[PDB]
Amino acid sequence: NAYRGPEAFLKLPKDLKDREALQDIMQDIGNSDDILAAVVLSATPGAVEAFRKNGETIRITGDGLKAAHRFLSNDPKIGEKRIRPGALIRVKKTEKGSWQIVQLP
Amino acid sequence: NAYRGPEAFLKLPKDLKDREALQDIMQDIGNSDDILAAVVLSATPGAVEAFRKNGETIRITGDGLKAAHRFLSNDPKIGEKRIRPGALIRVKKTEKGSWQIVQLP
């Protein structure tokens, strides 16, 4: 319960607005951050609706579905490995605000 | 890094708008989706600025510092656990929109 203190300490650059340097010192840590679990409610090649842990239902379309294309196309080789209601997926929100289907590193 | 598809298929409730039932099927999945890594850029007892993996800088103040306050005081005898520049902390944004320093389970 009680706070135990930080897990680790990284060596900072002088410039605290140098995002590249800051990302570099963090390279090994936090690599699943912002990659969220969601369960698929509906799926077509044009839209996937999914429920995430915070209770919101998101809709993934367009660019957000690109990486997952083969799992939405009804390719016979994929068969019922395809995205379908109940599928557990991972999602991430882009800086432009749309959700995308991704996977854990 | 080609997309590998859904990792599992879950049983859904009959009512796909029952948010509690949907929460219940994810009860053992994504449990610290809302807790993020951040590296501390500056720290005083009243304010911590930290940098997230997504490249955003966040500011934690007031109630957000309460859990961790014994590690933020100007007391060198806290030891190597003291929050200071470069500390790797874990953070969560509250329902009200404010960041807080937390710990992973």
Are A101 and B5 within 8 A, CB to CB? Answer: no
Long-range contacts of B28-34 (CB under 8 A, 24+ apart): B29/A37, B29/A53, B29/A88, B30/A36, B30/A37, B30/A52, B30/A53, B31/A53, B31/B105, B32/B104, B32/B105, B33/A36, B33/A37, B33/A52, B33/A53, B33/A54, B34/A53, B34/A54, B34/B92, B34/B93
Residue A58, chain B, CB below 8 Å: the answer is no
Cited resolution, angstroms: 1.6
Q: Are A33 and A104 in contact (CB under 8 A)?
A: no
d(CA B30, CA B7): 13
User: Quick check: B3 and A71 CB within 8 A?
Assistant: yes
Q: State the DSSP string of B83-99.
A: --TTEEEEEEE-TTS-E
CB contacts of B23 in chain A (<8 Å) are 53, 55
CB pair distance less than 8 Å for B9 and A86: yes
The CATH number for B70's domain is 2.40.50.140
Structural domain including A58 reads 33-105
The three-point CA angle B72-B76-B77 to 5° equals 100
| CB A68 within 8 Å of CB A74 | no
By the CB < 8 Å criterion, does B5 face chain A?
yes
Residue in chain B closest to A16 (alpha carbons) equals B41
Distance from CA of B20 to the nearest CA of A (A): 8
In whole angstroms, how far apart are CA B47 and each of A86, B43, B44, B70, B100? 43, 6, 5, 14, 11
> Does A56 contact B at CB distance below 8 Å?
no
- Interface membership of B81 toward A (CB under 8 Å): yes
